[PDB]
Amino acid sequence: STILVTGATGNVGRNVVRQLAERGHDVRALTRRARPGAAPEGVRVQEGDLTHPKTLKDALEGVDALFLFPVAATAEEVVGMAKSAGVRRIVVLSSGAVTAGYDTDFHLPVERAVEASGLEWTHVRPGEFAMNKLALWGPPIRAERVVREPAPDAGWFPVHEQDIADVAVLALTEEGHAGQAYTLNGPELLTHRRQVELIADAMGEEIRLEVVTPQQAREIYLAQGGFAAENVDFLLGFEDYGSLGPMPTAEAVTGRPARTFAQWARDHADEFRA
Ligand SMILES: NC(=O)c1ccc[n+]([C@@H]2O[C@H](COP(=O)([O-])OP(=O)(O)OC[C@H]3O[C@@H](n4cnc5c(N)ncnc54)[C@H](OP(=O)(O)O)[C@@H]3O)[C@@H](O)[C@H]2O)c1
Ligand SMILES: COc1cccc2c1C(=O)c1c(O)c3c(c(O)c1C2=O)C[C@@](O)(C(=O)CO)C[C@@H]3O[C@H]1C[C@H](N)[C@H](O)[C@H](C)O1
Numbered sequence: 001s002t003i004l005v006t007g008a009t010g011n012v013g014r015n016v017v018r019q020l021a022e023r024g025h026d027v028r029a030l031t032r033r034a035r036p037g038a039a040p041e042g043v044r045v046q047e048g049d050l051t052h053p054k055t056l057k058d059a060l061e062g063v064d065a066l067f068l069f070p071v072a073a074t075a076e077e078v079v080g081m082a083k084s085a086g087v088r089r090i091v092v093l094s095s096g097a098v099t100a101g102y103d104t105d106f107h108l109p110v111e112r113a114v115e116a117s118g119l120e121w122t123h124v125r126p127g128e129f130a131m132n133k134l135a136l137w138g139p140p141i142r143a144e145r146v147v148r149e150p151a152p153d154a155g156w157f158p159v160h161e162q163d164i165a166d167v168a169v170l171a172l173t174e175e176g177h178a179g180q181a182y183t184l185n186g187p188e189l190l191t192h193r194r195q196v197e198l199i200a201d202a203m204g205e206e207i208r209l210e211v212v213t214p215q216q217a218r219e220i221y222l223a224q225g226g227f228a229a230e231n232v233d234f235l236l237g238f239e240d241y242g243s244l245g246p247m248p249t250a251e252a253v254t255g256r257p258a259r260t261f262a263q264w265a266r267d268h269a270d271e272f273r274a
């Protein structure tokens, strides 16, 4: 099958591309800047921008299935071009915050455009990415083998990006996923303190956890920049994002147990080294 993967250079898309290519599909990788190593050997890199849909004309020509990275502003226009091109199937990178009812204005409009098109679809709704912990704790672990945390006894069910790619790949390539939205959590509830331990384990190094205040925290997050600054308000509960609920995992789709945060830490150990 001819499959175009948008979000191809991303945490999830890199994996989707590699697996579709191994299955021997005819794979195309959309990026805003075409260069070697955006995709593996034998994968066609197409230059284009989801915010400028006319740039996608050549990328969508002759395509059977599409992995769609979420861009609510143009989703309807991109879906419309997919439909014109004769795409039969769209698999969406969405968010478990849609399942929860928190997201009605970013990922949901992308889903809604896809649902309204008449093509086959599957929504992949990951919960909290394990990658968030490289983004937030990488810099200080790499600097000082320390983590500064206001909520060490808090936590959720972080999900391994390869679980997300596994589900996307099946939705793009087998029957029985049409009209499903799969919410993807990690297999265990873990405290931030436990998450720091598992990184310490994966690295084979001590990491000191310094329990700080939320105020101290946000200054540190604003100093650090990048992911930690851009989301600091939402991460410390200064602004609202929106006995537990039944927590679904990739097992429901793959037939295999969801990857653990321990496994995730081992896969990314070297990215935490100084
Ligand atoms: N972090 C979480 O906990 C969380 C939870 C739920 C859902 N999500 C969803 O997952 C996404 C993150 O995916 P990820 O981590 O795989 O992505 P990533 O590695 O952070 O994202 C990079 C990918 O998005 C592509 N992209 C972005 N804007 C584009 C545009 N205008 N035109 C074309 N391509 C564009 C980039 O292409 P280039 O090569 O052009 O840069 C790149 O391939 C989030 O945006 C969110 O929608 C995240
Ligand atoms: C049961 O779910 C949770 C349980 C514990 C903590 C959490 C959550 C949770 O749902 C959650 C989020 O959904 C979001 C965030 C988050 O920290 C948490 C938890 O901490 C951060 C976030 O707001 C941003 O980074 C945006 O800058 C993105 C996201 O918000 C969602 C909903 C927004 N209204 C918006 O639609 C955005 C795009 O996605």
Ligand SMILES: COc1cccc2c1C(=O)c1c(O)c3c(c(O)c1C2=O)C[C@@](O)(C(=O)CO)C[C@@H]3O[C@H]1C[C@H](N)[C@H](O)[C@H](C)O1
Binding pocket: 095, 096, 097, 100, 106, 126, 127, 128, 129, 132, 156, 227, 230, 231
């Ligand atoms: C069940 O959902 C969750 C449960 C617990 C934690 C979480 C989430 C969650 O959904 C979530 C996110 O969706 C996003 C983030 C996130 O931290 C969480 C949780 O922590 C971080 C974020 O800033 C990025 O990494 C950059 O794209 C934004 C990202 O999504 C979207 C929304 C952002 N506002 C940003 O504008 C862009 C649209 O990415």
